[PDB]
Amino acid sequence: SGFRKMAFPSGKVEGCMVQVTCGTTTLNGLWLDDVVYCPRHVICTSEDMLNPNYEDLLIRKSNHNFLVQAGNVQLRVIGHSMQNCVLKLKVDTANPKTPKYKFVRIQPGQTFSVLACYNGSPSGVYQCAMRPNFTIKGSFLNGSCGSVGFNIDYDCVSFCYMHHMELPTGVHAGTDLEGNFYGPFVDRQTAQAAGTDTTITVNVLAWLYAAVINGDRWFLNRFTTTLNDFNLVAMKYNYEPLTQDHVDILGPLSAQTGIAVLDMCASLKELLQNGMNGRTILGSALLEDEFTPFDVVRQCSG
Amino acid sequence: SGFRKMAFPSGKVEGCMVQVTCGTTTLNGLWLDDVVYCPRHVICTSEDMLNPNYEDLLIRKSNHNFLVQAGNVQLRVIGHSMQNCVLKLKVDTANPKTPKYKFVRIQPGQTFSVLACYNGSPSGVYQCAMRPNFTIKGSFLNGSCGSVGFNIDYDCVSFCYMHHMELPTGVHAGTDLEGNFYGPFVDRQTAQAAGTDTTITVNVLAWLYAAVINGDRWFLNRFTTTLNDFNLVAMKYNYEPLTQDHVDILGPLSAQTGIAVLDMCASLKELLQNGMNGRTILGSALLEDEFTPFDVVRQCSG
Ligand SMILES: CNC(=O)C[C@H](Cc1ccc(F)cc1)NC(=O)[C@@H](Cc1ccc(Cl)cc1Cl)NC(=O)[C@H](N)Cc1ccccc1C#N
Ligand SMILES: CNC(=O)C[C@H](Cc1ccc(F)cc1)NC(=O)[C@@H](Cc1ccc(Cl)cc1Cl)NC(=O)[C@H](N)Cc1ccccc1C#N
Numbered sequence: 001s002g003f004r005k006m007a008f009p010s011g012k013v014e015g016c017m018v019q020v021t022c023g024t025t026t027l028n029g030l031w032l033d034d035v036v037y038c039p040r041h042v043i044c045t046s047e048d049m050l051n052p053n054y055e056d057l058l059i060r061k062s063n064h065n066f067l068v069q070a071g072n073v074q075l076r077v078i079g080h081s082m083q084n085c086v087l088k089l090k091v092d093t094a095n096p097k098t099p100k101y102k103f104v105r106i107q108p109g110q111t112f113s114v115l116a117c118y119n120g121s122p123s124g125v126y127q128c129a130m131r132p133n134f135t136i137k138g139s140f141l142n143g144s145c146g147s148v149g150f151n152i153d154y155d156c157v158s159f160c161y162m163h164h165m166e167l168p169t170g171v172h173a174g175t176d177l178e179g180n181f182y183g184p185f186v187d188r189q190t191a192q193a194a195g196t197d198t199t200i201t202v203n204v205l206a207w208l209y210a211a212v213i214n215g216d217r218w219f220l221n222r223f224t225t226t227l228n229d230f231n232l233v234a235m236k237y238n239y240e241p242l243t244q245d246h247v248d249i250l251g252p253l254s255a256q257t258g259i260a261v262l263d264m265c266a267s268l269k270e271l272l273q274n275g276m277n278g279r280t281i282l283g284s285a286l287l288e289d290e291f292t293p294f295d296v297v298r299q300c301s302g
Numbered sequence: 303s304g305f306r307k308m309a310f311p312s313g314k315v316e317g318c319m320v321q322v323t324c325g326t327t328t329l330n331g332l333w334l335d336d337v338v339y340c341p342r343h344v345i346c347t348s349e350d351m352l353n354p355n356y357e358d359l360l361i362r363k364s365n366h367n368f369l370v371q372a373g374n375v376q377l378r379v380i381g382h383s384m385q386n387c388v389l390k391l392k393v394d395t396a397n398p399k400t401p402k403y404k405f406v407r408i409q410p411g412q413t414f415s416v417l418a419c420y421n422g423s424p425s426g427v428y429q430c431a432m433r434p435n436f437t438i439k440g441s442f443l444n445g446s447c448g449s450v451g452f453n454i455d456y457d458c459v460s461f462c463y464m465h466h467m468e469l470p471t472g473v474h475a476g477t478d479l480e481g482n483f484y485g486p487f488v489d490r491q492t493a494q495a496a497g498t499d500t501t502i503t504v505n506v507l508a509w510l511y512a513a514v515i516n517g518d519r520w521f522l523n524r525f526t527t528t529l530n531d532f533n534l535v536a537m538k539y540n541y542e543p544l545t546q547d548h549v550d551i552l553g554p555l556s557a558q559t560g561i562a563v564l565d566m567c568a569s570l571k572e573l574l575q576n577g578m579n580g581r582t583i584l585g586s587a588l589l590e591d592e593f594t595p596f597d598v599v600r601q602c603s604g
């Protein structure tokens with residue numbers, strides 16, 4: 001028992017992290033087979049970053065402008081190209097530690113593990129959720145750009161995120177591994193604002209089920225509400241509306257605990273309207289929305 | 303910026319996890335050089351577990367009773383011995399992925415990363431603190447015993463914890479890698495209770511400094527208290543007393559933020575006496591005590 005924010009084991013990804021240097025800019029890259037992927041803004045100077053024209057900047061580069069280091073072993077760049085906001089550097093050596101992998105774009109409300117890296121060296125691993133406004137609330141310092149997010153499914157790594165920038169609000173924005181930004185952001189050093197965020201309702205319900213599985217029952221009640229009457233309460237508290245497919249996704253947890261989804265929604269309605277009155281749920285005094293139903297099932301099997 | 307519970311990258315440890323089977327009991331072991339370390343209770347049957355005499359049970363075992371699998375490759379056991387509560391199985395192959403490592407015993411109030419494993423296969427990684435009562439609040443299901451906790455310092459892995467059991471309260475107990483239990487526990491299937499726990503004061507202050515570094519300042523005030531007058535408040539709220547060495551350990555963070563330690567203690571006194579009045583600190587509505595000063599500095603460098 002117990003319930004923790006749990007990242008995937010990071011070993012398969014650690015073997016892929018490299019350092020990419022162009023001029024005086026150094027960030028992280030991802031070395032899979034004979035290609036290194038990294039944020040294209042590595043080619044910009046401090047002046048370029050305000051309003052870069054990346055097509056012009058790349059045409060002015062050559063292979064020998066790119067320094068790639070995998071540990072202390074330098075990798076020779078034999079080709080460079082751009083795909084959306086990612087740079088692809090072809091190298092003369094295939095990474096012998098390339099895992100089975102896929103490039104997948106995730107949905108808001110889904111979670112993934114982040115391997116925070118600096119100068120090509122992994123420093124820590126943690127879970128992130130993609131917010132409804134396409135930002136993530138990560139932990140990143142200067143030098144972290146090019147760090148990647150991923151999920152692992154039967155030894156296949158699904159890469160879903162490459163880190164590009166911290167916004168002025170301290171939240172974080174990046175792309176999928178095809179270089180397409182999550183959300184309404186661009187890779188230039190200008191102040192950009194995310195849209196308004198909302199709380200991920202299905203994840204809060206999943207976490208309430210985790211809590212019941214782990215023995216926290218004080219918030220349960222004998223009431224049951226309707227999907228429509230709950231969604232009226234959700235809108236008032238800036239929660240995403242609940243759909244029938246969310247109820248279906250929550251079916252397994254509802255069956256394991258014997259608490260119908262709409263019964264748990266009555267508990268959530270009361271928690272939103274009255275607070276916790278000084279009590280905690282799974283060690284939190286707030287309603288947690290960064291665990292998916294899958295995260296709960298993976299950790300609360302027993 | 304941002305502040306997250308961050309584990310160490312787990313790759314160096316993943317390469318050491320194996321499966322150890324004795325009879326119908328399967329758990330995890332740690333394969334370093336030509337030795338596999340695992341909980342000695344793998345040699346017990348269901349009946350033995352109530353009141354095992356491990357010296358008798360081990361003398362009745364032979365090498366061929368132990369099945370060790372590293373992935374799908376079976377390792378041949380060529381010797382067995384017991385050190386306190388850990389079994390040491392000598393194998394005919396040195397682990398080619400053995401990292402530089404040390405066996406270190408940690409102190410209550412310190413943190414470490416846990417690689418949760420099942421059947422020798424790593425499933426997730428997360429941070430734990432050793433509670434003042436020598437338990438950890440982990441996330442472990444059946445089959446997790448033998449999972450290890452560790453810190454990493456300049457590519458040297460310091461192993462500090464091997465998981466042995468879940469207590470009836472749902473918290474977790476284990477040993478150092480010499481097999482010596484943390485706290486007043488024994489490896490037998492009987493109900494055992496931990497001593498009363500307390501909140502780790504220096505860690506709460508470290509986390510308040512993290513919050514200031516990240517822009518949460520609402521709890522600051524112009525007041526400053528004395529070490530003695532704060533410790534009077536600490537005792538009332540079941541907080542560990544603050545020592546001058548704790549003030550010294552907090553010096554670097556105090557200098558980086560410009561907030562004297564005893565000034566931050568005045569803030570903590572007010573937070574304990576009045577609550578948060580509906581506000582949050584680093585995304586929590588509770589005072590967090592599972593980050594050490596080192597954890598904060600490692601993540602809040604910038
Ligand atoms: C208090 N917040 C900050 O100071 C972070 C500032 C916020 C800010 C944003 C826009 C602006 F006009 C003024 C300030 N952001 C950065 O400075 C960005 C600048 C940038 C560079 C490349 C590209 Cl394509 C876009 C941008 Cl916008 N630099 C990075 O993200 C670094 N690579 C990583 C980094 C460095 C330092 C701190 C955190 C992180 C991280 N993670
Ligand atoms: C609601 N809580 C539980 O049901 C867990 C129970 C609590 C309980 C404790 C004592 C008792 F008399 C009755 C119940 N504990 C276990 O059943 C232990 C039994 C045990 C075995 C070997 C050794 Cl040396 C000591 C013990 Cl005590 N089994 C394990 O820890 C497993 N290896 C791992 C495990 C299995 C299942 C659930 C969580 C975990 C984990 N992690």
Ligand SMILES: [Cl-]
Pocket residue numbers: 003004005307
């Ligand atoms: Cl957590």
Ligand SMILES: [Cl-]
Pocket residue numbers: 101102103104
């Ligand atoms: Cl793909």
Ligand SMILES: [Cl-]
Pocket residue numbers: 005305306307
């Ligand atoms: Cl966290």
Ligand SMILES: [Cl-]
Pocket residue numbers: 403404405406
């Ligand atoms: Cl040692």
Ligand code: NA
Pocket residue numbers: none
């Ligand atoms: Na493609």
Ligand code: NA
Pocket residue numbers: none
């Ligand atoms: Na020794």
